[PDB]
């Protein structure tokens, strides 16, 4: 022990533990080795290694799975939905891709919610065909009648009621006559008469069954008043994957 | 990255297809100006490098220039026992026998052959009869590109050699994209052969000797620890 | 010894402790890669700058990273791996340390403003399983932008290239969405 006490405490003069010494030295040696091996070298990466490994990771991945994607690309979207080889792998992975990228807006189920379309069902705003769906995906995605003097506070109510009749039958006589007249004038141009709707515009059919969209009179009043304005963001930048996804979405209904 | 070769390390005994490609390149391109006197032709059959068929060697030899004689002045048929020819002057260059050691060596040749781009935006006119290289460092530089104290602002300098190859100068019999980069690598390896043919034997000797001497040294360490035991036991 | 000497011990400690800081921090000031902005990039617009401050005030950083690592899977999930140049303007830097929620670095258009509004208003509503807190107040409070000029001026002093013109020219939910929409956009378009 050593001669000096610090309130109670005294200290033994003992040797550093051999193992402790070894580990310390080993770490140092490893460090020098690491530095020589890293930036200051290691073989396998030409030039100098860096985060450059990223390129390698992607590249090997590309070599490994390029064929699967490339095979799919040649095939038409409709074919890529049908075929369980590509087509089935396209639904599960396309379905895989779907969960990562699309599920947050269109639901894990792809059923959708208020403000987002149900991809599973039969009804398509932009058109159900393969080309249409693909386009929706690749390049991405309602006029405010409250203001247009004529529409006003009353005109909107009437049009709302009339549309609910096109969709089904509620009972409000004033909200019907007026609305029919207005729809024929304005709405019909995009939604058609009897509300078939026009896919070109992405104008949905008014003659629909109970969907997730705000069917209620009030909600219809709001969409008519203020108008719509919904976006489907383009996956061309973010996203081959777009194609598989189109195949998956197409496969979803049927 | 750095495009390391095969021999760059403790192993790598001179992948021979690469050397045959470099030979296709050297005899059809570089031989027009360069030579390799320090290289016998028969070495194209010795192991380690291109283990070509001797008969083809004799044919290729007889198909070269005429090396006259040493005893009776008379243009002979140039037997393999002689050396590669020599291009000396009047628009010709040095000997490439050991150029892979007079400079990490082959990387110099690769990154030299690689790089003859147009003149930069300091002297686009350039020079008449001289062409530009981004890696040669022993060439002239115009005064427009030098700094205030004579040092050049360019990466390389102006070399008297023209660009040796275009996009697809020659065909490979084995089947391979004969772009400029692959040809450069191949010819670099061929020159390294021409300079260090006994590389693989070097490495194998090094391995054998390291092993035997490690063994001897271990045994001597045991003998020492033993002999010096009764004198290093109480402390 | 130096055990006995208070000044010596203090001095050596100060010296010993300093080397790492000098070695790591100082050279960064000098290195261009970390200094250079992406070529296309401009400073945050006044609304986006205000929104960024809101993002700071709320504590979004505590759940959301803004740094994409150079791995294939994160590239796949998030997008291009973050570059130093992207963060050049960021006083202070937003890189995360934790991802309770997903990485925000490159939401350079991924979601619509409407989605962002609904989600911020109530994350559970859009994403039922979300852990994220509801931030409805963002809708409730308006921005006065009294301070925005001062903020930009200070940032300019700090090196951000705001024009005099930019300062002069300059709801909270709106600002937050505006901020979120810019993230990672600079690289993609450039
Ligand atoms: C939130 C920003 C969404 C993202 C993420 C995804 N989708 Fe989307 N999509 C969204 C909306 C609000 C709409 C309706 C737009 C409108 O007309 O108002 C859509 C539409 C589609 C469609 C068209 C459906 C149709 O009826 O024709 C498709 C095919 C579609 N979305 C596909 C899709 C895919 C595959 C996605 C992941 C890559 C995806 N969407 C993401 C909102 C959002
Ligand atoms: C004449 C048309 C040439 C042919 C074809 C090739 N080379 Fe050459 N080379 C030539 C000259 C006149 C010079 C001297 C350049 C100078 O400025 O002094 C050279 C030089 C070289 C060198 C040496 C470079 C150095 O650093 O000194 C090398 C390594 C070299 N050349 C390689 C080379 C190869 C591989 C060729 C065939 C692909 C080749 N050269 C052809 C003239 C000519
Ligand atoms: C031209 C473009 C028009 C005009 C003249 C009208 N509508 Fe609208 N409408 C249009 C589009 C492209 C969409 C889809 C909006 C989106 O998805 O973001 C709509 C939507 C509606 C809806 C909502 C359907 C739903 O709940 O999902 C309604 C109720 C609707 N439109 C009604 C409506 C009425 C009553 C109109 C005349 C006053 C009218 N639209 C005109 C495109 C267009
Ligand atoms: C801790 C809990 C937080 C808090 C403090 C913040 N968020 Fe997030 N966030 C969190 C989770 C678990 C998720 C995933 C579930 C979901 O999407 O709701 C998110 C998600 C987001 C997103 C969407 C990211 C994406 O899917 O690409 C955004 C844009 C987002 N959060 C923004 C955001 C803002 C602005 C925050 C401060 C107000 C904020 N978050 C805080 C978890 C948490």
Interacting residues of A239 by C-beta distance below 8 A, sequence separation 6+: A101, A137, A138, A245
Given a contact cutoff of 8 angstroms between Cβ atoms, the answer to whether C81 and C106 are in contact is no
| Ligand 3 centroid, distance to A134 Cα (angstroms) | 23
Rounded to whole angstroms, the Cα distance separating C64 from C101 reads: 5
Kindly report the protein residue whose alpha carbon is nearest to atom 14 of ligand 4.
C101
Taking the CA of C108 as reference, the closest ligand is 4
Pocket test for ligand 2, best of B93, B158, B169, B170 (most atoms within 8 A of CB): B93
Rounded to whole angstroms, the Cα distance separating A217 from A157 reads: 8
Tell me how close the Cα of A55 comes to any Cα of chain C, in angstroms.
9
Interacting residues of C133 by C-beta distance below 8 A, sequence separation 6+: C123
Question: Quick check: do A and C touch, 3+ CB pairs under 8 A?
Answer: yes
Whether omega before C92 lies within 30 degrees of 0, making that bond cis, reads: yes
* Assigned token pair, B212: 């035997």
Helices (DSSP H) in chain B: which residue ranges? Answer: 16-28, 54-62, 106-113, 180-195, 199-227
Given a contact cutoff of 8 angstroms between Cβ atoms, the answer to whether B46 and B39 are in contact is no
| A65 lies within 8 A of chain C by CB | no
Which of A112, A113, A139, A240 is the best substitution to test chain C (most C C-beta atoms within 10 A)? A113
Q: Tokens 């040696």 label which residue? A: A29
| Ligand 1 centroid, distance to C115 Cα (angstroms) | 12
A 10 A CB-CB count for C169 gives 13
Residues of C in contact with A61 (CB under 8 A): 72
Element (H, E) at C165: helix C164-169
Tell me how close the Cα of A192 comes to any Cα of chain C, in angstroms.
27
Interacting residues of B177 by C-beta distance below 8 A, sequence separation 6+: none
Please name which of B173, B122, B175 lies closest in space to residue B144, comparing C-alpha atoms. B122
- Residues near ligand 4 (Cβ within 6 A): A 104; C 55, 58-60, 62-64, 100-102, 104, 107, 110, 119-120, 123, 127, 130-133, 135, 176, 180
Distances (CA, A) of A152 to A149, A162, A227, B199: 6, 16, 13, 93
Rounded to whole angstroms, the Cα distance separating B218 from C6 reads: 51
Interacting residues of B103 by C-beta distance below 8 A, sequence separation 6+: B109
- Contacts of C among chains (3+ CB pairs under 8 A): A
Q: Tokens 């777009």 label which residue? A: A242
* Nearest atom (ligand 4) to Cα of C60: 37
Interacting residues of C47 by C-beta distance below 8 A, sequence separation 6+: C143, C170, C174, C175, C178, C179
Buried-state track A124-134, b at ≥16 Cβ within 10 A, e below 16? bbbebebebbb
Residues of A in contact with C114 (CB under 8 A): 115, 229-231
Rounded to whole angstroms, the Cα distance separating C51 from B48 reads: 69
Q: How many CA atoms lie within 13 A of C7 on its CB side?
A: 0
For C72, the closest of A57, A115, A237 (CB atoms) is: A57
A 10 A CB-CB count for A4 gives 9
Rounded to whole angstroms, the Cα distance separating B35 from B99 reads: 11
Question: Quick check: do B and C touch, 3+ CB pairs under 8 A?
Answer: no
Rounded to whole angstroms, the Cα distance separating B110 from B72 reads: 42
Tell me how close the Cα of A52 comes to any Cα of chain B, in angstroms.
10
Distances (CA, A) of B126 to A93, B162, B165, B221: 58, 14, 21, 67
Inter-helix orientation angle B180-195/B16-28, to 10°? 100
DSSP-derived letter for residue A204 is P
**Distance from CA of residue B47 to its chain's centroid?**
18
Q: What is the dihedral of CA B145, B151, B157, B160, to 10 degrees?
A: 100
A 10 A CB-CB count for A156 gives 23
Please name which of A116, A112, A147, A119 lies closest in space to residue A133, comparing C-alpha atoms. A119
- Contacts of B among chains (3+ CB pairs under 8 A): A
Please name which of C42, C107, C113 lies closest in space to residue C68, comparing C-alpha atoms. C107
Given a contact cutoff of 8 angstroms between Cβ atoms, the answer to whether B116 and B133 are in contact is yes
Rounded to whole angstroms, the Cα distance separating C95 from A189 reads: 50
Instruction: Please answer yes or no on whether A61 and C109 come within 8 Å at the CB atom.
Output: no
| Ligand 4 centroid, distance to C151 Cα (angstroms) | 26
Inter-helix orientation angle A241-252/A130-139, to 10°? 130
DSSP-derived letter for residue A195 is G
Which of A46, A51, A56 is the best substitution to test chain B (most B C-beta atoms within 10 A)? A46
| Ligand 3 centroid, distance to A101 Cα (angstroms) | 27
Q: What is the dihedral of CA A25, A31, A34, A39, to 10 degrees?
A: -150
Kindly report the protein residue whose alpha carbon is nearest to atom 32 of ligand 1.
A137
Name the binding residues of C for heme c.
Answer: 60, 63-64, 111, 119, 132
Element (H, E) at A99: helix A94-101
A 10 A CB-CB count for B27 gives 15
SS3 at position B157? strand
Rounded to whole angstroms, the Cα distance separating C116 from A132 reads: 26
* Nearest atom (ligand 1) to Cα of A246: 35
Rounded to whole angstroms, the Cα distance separating B155 from B116 reads: 12
Given a contact cutoff of 8 angstroms between Cβ atoms, the answer to whether C67 and C95 are in contact is yes
B33 labeled part of a ligand binding site: yes
Write out the DSSP string of A119-166: SSSS--SS-SSHHHHHHHHHH-----TTTSTTSHHHHHHHHHHHHHHH
| Determination technique used | cryo-EM
Rounded to whole angstroms, the Cα distance separating A61 from A56 reads: 8
Kindly report the protein residue whose alpha carbon is nearest to atom 33 of ligand 1.
A137
Please name which of C190, C148, C180, C187 lies closest in space to residue C55, comparing C-alpha atoms. C180
Which of A237, A240, A241, A245 is the best substitution to test chain C (most C C-beta atoms within 10 A)? A237
SS3 at position C27? helix
Distances (CA, A) of A65 to A88, B87, B146: 16, 52, 52
Instruction: Please answer yes or no on whether A47 and B9 come within 8 Å at the CB atom.
Output: no
Rounded to whole angstroms, the Cα distance separating A177 from C11 reads: 92
Please name which of A137, A114, A138, A115 lies closest in space to residue A252, comparing C-alpha atoms. A137
Helices (DSSP H) in B95-198: which residue ranges? Answer: 106-113, 180-195
| A231 lies within 8 A of chain C by CB | yes
Buried-state track A53-82, b at ≥16 Cβ within 10 A, e below 16? ebeeeeeeeeeeeeebeeebeebebbebbb
Taking the CA of A118 as reference, the closest ligand is 1
Instruction: Please answer yes or no on whether A46 and B1 come within 8 Å at the CB atom.
Output: yes
Residues of B in contact with A42 (CB under 8 A): none
Tell me how close the Cα of C64 comes to any Cα of chain A, in angstroms.
17
| Ligand 1 centroid, distance to A112 Cα (angstroms) | 9
Instruction: Please answer yes or no on whether A48 and B1 come within 8 Å at the CB atom.
Output: yes
A 10 A CB-CB count for C155 gives 19
Element (H, E) at C15: helix C6-30
Element (H, E) at C160: none
Instruction: Please answer yes or no on whether A54 and C188 come within 8 Å at the CB atom.
Output: no
Total residues belonging to chain B: 235
Please name which of A103, A130, A140 lies closest in space to residue A254, comparing C-alpha atoms. A130
């Amino acid at each position: 022990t050593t001669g000096h006490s610090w309130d109670g405490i005294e200290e033994l003069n003992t040797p550093l533990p051999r193992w402790w010494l070894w580990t310390f030295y080993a770490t140092i040696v490893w460090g020098v080795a690491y530095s020589i091996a890293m930036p200051a070298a290691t073989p396998g990466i030409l030039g100098s290694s860096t985060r450059a490994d990223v390129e390698k990771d992607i590249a090997k991945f590309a070599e490994m799975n390029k064929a699967v994607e490339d095979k799919l690309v040649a095939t038409d979207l409709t074919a890529i939905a049908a075929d369980p080889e590509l087509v089935t792998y396209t639904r599960n992975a396309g379905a895989a891709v779907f969960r990562t990228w699309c599920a947050q807006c269109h639901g894990a189920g792809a059923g959708g919610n208020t403000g987002f379309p149900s991809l599973l069902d039969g009804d398509w705003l932009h058109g159900g065909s393969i080309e249409t769906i693909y386009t929706n995906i690749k390049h991405g995605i309602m006029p405010a009648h409250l203001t247009d003097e004529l529409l006003e506070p009353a005109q909107i109510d009437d049009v709302v009621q009339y549309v609910l009749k096109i969709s089904g039958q509620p009972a409000d006589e004033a909200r019907a006559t007026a609305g029919q007249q207005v729809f024929a004038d304005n709405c019909v141009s995009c939604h058609g008469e009897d509300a078939k709707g026009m896919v070109e515009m992405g104008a949905p059919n008014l003659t629909d069954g109970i969907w997730l969209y705000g069917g209620d009179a009030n909600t219809i009043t709001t969409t008519i008043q203020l108008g719509r304005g919904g976006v489907m963001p383009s996956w061309s930048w973010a996203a081959a994957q777009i194609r598989a996804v189109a195949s998956y979405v197409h496969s979803l209904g049927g | 990255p750095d495009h390391a070769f095969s021999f760059e390390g403790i192993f790598g005994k001179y992948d021979q297809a690469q050397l045959r490609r470099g030979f296709q390149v050297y005899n059809e391109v570089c031989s027009a100006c360069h030579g390799m006197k320090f290289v016998p032709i028969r070495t194209l059959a010795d192991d380690g490098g291109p283990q070509l068929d001797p008969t083809f060697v004799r044919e290729y030899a007889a198909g070269l220039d005429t090396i006259i004689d040493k005893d009776s002045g008379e243009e002979r048929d140039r037997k393999e026992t002689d050396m590669f020819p020599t291009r000396v002057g009047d628009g010709m260059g040095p000997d490439l026998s050991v150029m892979a050691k007079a400079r990490g060596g082959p990387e110099y040749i690769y990154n030299y052959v690689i790089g003859f781009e147009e003149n930069p935006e300091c002297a686009p006119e350039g020079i008449d009869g001289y062409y530009y290289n981004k890696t040669f460092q022993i060439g002239g530089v115009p005064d427009t590109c030098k700094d205030a104290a004579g040092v050049k602002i360019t990466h390389g300098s102006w070399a008297r050699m023209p660009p040796p190859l275009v996009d697809d100068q020659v065909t490979y019999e084995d089947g391979t994209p004969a772009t400029v980069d692959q040809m450069a690598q191949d010819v670099s390896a061929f020159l390294m052969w021409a300079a260090e043919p006994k590389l693989v034997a070097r490495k194998q000797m090094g391995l054998v000797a390291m092993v035997m001497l490690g063994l001897l040294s271990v045994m001597l360490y045991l003998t020492n620890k033993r002999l010096w035991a009764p004198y290093k036991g109480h402390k | 010894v130096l055990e006995k000497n208070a000044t010596l011990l203090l001095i050596f400690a100060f010296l010993v402790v300093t080397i790492g800081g000098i070695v790591e921090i100082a050279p960064l000031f000098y290195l261009e890669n970390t200094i250079e902005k992406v070529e296309g990039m401009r400073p945050y617009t006044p609304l986006e700058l205000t929104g960024r401050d809101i993002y700071i005030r709320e504590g979004c950083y505590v759940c959301h990273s803004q740094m994409i690592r150079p791995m294939r899977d994160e590239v796949e999930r998030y997008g291009h791996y973050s570059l130093a140049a992207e963060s050049m303007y960021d006083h202070p830097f937003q890189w995360g340390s934790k991802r309770t929620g997903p990485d925000l670095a490159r939401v350079g258009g991924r979601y619509s403003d409407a989605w962002h509004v609904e989600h911020l208003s109530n994350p559970q509503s859009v994403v039922p399983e979300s852990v994220m807190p509801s931030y409805s107040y963002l809708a409730n409070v308006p921005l006065d932008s009294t301070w925005i000029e001062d903020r930009v001026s200070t940032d300019a002093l700090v090196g951000v290239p705001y024009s005099a013109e930019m300062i002069a020219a300059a709801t909270e939910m709106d600002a937050l969405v505006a901020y979120l929409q810019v993230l990672g956009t600079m690289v993609d378009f450039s």
